[PDB]
Amino acid sequence: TKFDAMTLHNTGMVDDGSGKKKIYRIENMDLVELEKRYYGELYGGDSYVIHYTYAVNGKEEHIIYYWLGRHSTSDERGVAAAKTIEIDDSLGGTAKQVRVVQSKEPNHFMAMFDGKLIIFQGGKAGWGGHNSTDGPGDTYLLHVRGTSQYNTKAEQVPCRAESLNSNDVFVLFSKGGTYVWAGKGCTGDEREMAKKIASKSPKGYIMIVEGQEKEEFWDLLGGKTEYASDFSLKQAENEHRPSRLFQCSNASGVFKAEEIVDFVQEDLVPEDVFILDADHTIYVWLGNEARNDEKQMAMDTAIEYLESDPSGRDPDTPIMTVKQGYEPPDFVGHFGVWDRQLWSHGMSYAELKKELGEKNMSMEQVREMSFSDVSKYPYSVLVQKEGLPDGIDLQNKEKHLTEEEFEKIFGMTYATFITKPAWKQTQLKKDKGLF
Amino acid sequence: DEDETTALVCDNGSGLVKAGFAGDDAPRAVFPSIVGRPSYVGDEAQILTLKYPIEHGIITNWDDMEKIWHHTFYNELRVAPEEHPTLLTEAPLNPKANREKMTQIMFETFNVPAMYVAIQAVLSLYASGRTTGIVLDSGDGVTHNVPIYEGYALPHAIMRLDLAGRDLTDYLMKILTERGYSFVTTAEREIVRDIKEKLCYVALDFENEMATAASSSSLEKSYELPDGQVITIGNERFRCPETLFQPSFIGMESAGIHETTYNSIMKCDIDIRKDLYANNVMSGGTTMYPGIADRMQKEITALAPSTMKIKIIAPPERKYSVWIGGSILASLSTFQQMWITKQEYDEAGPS
Ligand SMILES: Nc1ncnc2c1ncn2[C@@H]1O[C@H](COP(=O)(O)OP(=O)(O)O)[C@@H](O)[C@H]1O
Ligand SMILES: [Ca+2]
Ligand SMILES: [Ca+2]
Ligand SMILES: [Ca+2]
Ligand SMILES: [Ca+2]
Ligand SMILES: [Ca+2]
């Protein structure tokens, strides 16, 4: 009957990105200018400094981008930052300095490369020594994905079948030949850059469609295994509900859920809890360093999401919980490229199932009181302080005891124990080792 | 040999000296910044008459500091200061003459080839991989909030608080004596720091976390002294770090590390504040308490607009972020332009 005015009360690419770019890469504690030939190619283990000079309306101003790879050591990140200052000071302070991290590039940055960026997995040595995987190889796999236009990226993935996703296309470079896998929801712009990338092969490409995968294919990917084959990902977002991710945290002092749009793996913080909506499933990502206050409230607030769904509830929608490092290939598909070297020690989900026992990796699904409503655990369980069965009110551990065994330990019923004074309740509990 | 000239970096720390060779993941030698008399230097010290040269992050016993630098160069690092250039750190607001006597001391009693002086907090932003941000360097004896924009500090907002690690350890000794223990054997001060550094943590809501301490034993942990005795620390775990947010605990009247950061950010330009709000880098050993990042997001979110994204940055290796910064800076092959040569000293004085 009234419109709360707070409903209403609740950035641009300064140029076309067509100016000149001078890409310098952090090598050996110094800046090495990249050859123009390798423009559009960044290594996720090395940091880069990009110098964009542009004149808009006859006004020459300067922007310095320092792109920090996800696996670039602290030494390269500092050298990237330290030299962006020096190229700024050389321009006298006329430069605006912008920090770019892998998988979260701004719109202007991707425009400088016409939206075609190739991020190999590798890099030069860090802290001045050892392995330098500066070669993609004779055999590698690439992942072409576009959240919106102007961001069509190709990133090197582990040459395994699990890495395959349905919303995207892939390019396999082998000694035998180059093949281009096509997914059910492969947008044209993604499919195009794959062919443009695959066309570099003097041998050519052989496009493959999902389902029509010949056997010579998997013998190069090592063999078949379940990849990101979800209903939502196979379709195109024109018809399936847009995959959404929310961040739940008490860090602001109040438990809140905030939407993360264009979500990727880096957006996940191991200190807070996240919820992913996929229509068919709703996942609860539990940070390893997350708070038990956050975890529970996220598990519950997820249920309030199914109920207040402004559409068909489908009340048996699986609200499943996942743990950092034990992510299934269907949870990762709504994100872009998933790196296992971060939290899963570089092991695929299948390799994790073998070592961790499959059962231990099983995703659990979400499903003041009287004495009856309290789960009764034995006295030996509640008397300890060391990893006791969870779900116990550690403040009032006396309730998790039975009415019978209560009278043997305390000498009275819980009905009389609560009518005793509070200083007595805290005293008798500590005596019986149940504080 | 060292025709590349192996460089060196020293963080002149209020309570701990962090020094090593440039181009390494971390410093090789970390020893306490103490000089003792009945010479006696380092952890070898603990009847004595101890003194702190850099008690408040600035050097006062100027020539006395030479002995500490000597201990670093000759005994801890096992190096010859004549053959290796040096990178020295300075406080956020060092006296203009503080640097000059450092310049002279290096070039004279040690005959260093070259030297450079860098702000401790500007080094910390380099390890973080950023040029813009406000740093909190909570050390042993002093804490500083230093806004940094595009590589250089903003001195109109550099702020300082003298509440830091050593004060917290003493407050733990008090509340632990209040708990019914008694360790003041001067050597036993380190046992308390081991308790602090391993069993303490910061609470998001001090009042709520204090209430659970009297209605339960959940937060209670146990510590084995070297005498084999197992003592139990309870509400003290979060009380010791809470002094940083409520300086009244030890008696000071200053504001806490949450308010000082707000004041410092607000003394800056409105447009640079968002990046300063989204790049709140943390440095120092006293920023290594569990949960300090969460509360600092909480407290700052309150005193700040409802539409400001607050991001507290906590590099895993922040106890040595200053050293890691200099090792990066010194190892720059473009740092010879900023080195000060011995000839330039003889010609221009320390200047
Ligand atoms: N894990 C930890 N938890 C809490 N405090 C710590 C931890 N590690 C070190 N400290 C404290 O940090 C202080 C040292 O910090 P540091 O950065 O060396 O100071 P400065 O650089 O001013 O010398 C010590 O007083 C120590 O008590
Ligand atoms: Ca590298
Ligand atoms: Ca500038
Ligand atoms: Ca896609
Ligand atoms: Ca949190
Ligand atoms: Ca310091």
Author numbering:
A (entry chain v): 376 to 385, 393 to 749, 757 to 824
B (entry chain g): 1 to 38, 52 to 59, 64 to 368
List passages from the publication reporting this PDB structure:
Villin is an actin filament nucleating, severing, capping and bundling protein; however, the structural basis for villin’s functions and the characteristics of the actin polymerization nucleus remain poorly understood. Villin is a member of the calcium-regulated gelsolin family of actin filament severing and capping proteins, a class of proteins found in Asgard archaea and nearly all eukaryotes. Eukaryotic G domains are often associated with a ~65-residue C-terminal α-helical headpiece (HP) domain, indicating that this architecture was likely present in the last eukaryotic common ancestor. In vitro, villin can nucleate actin polymerization and bundle filaments.
Thus, the actin conformations bound to the separated halves of villin have relaxed toward the twisted G-actin conformation by 8.7° and 2.2° relative to VA3 complex subunits A3 and A2, respectively. (I and J) Comparison of actin subunit A2 (tan) with the G-actin structure from the V4V6-HP/actin complex (magenta, RMSD of 0.9 Å for 346 residues).
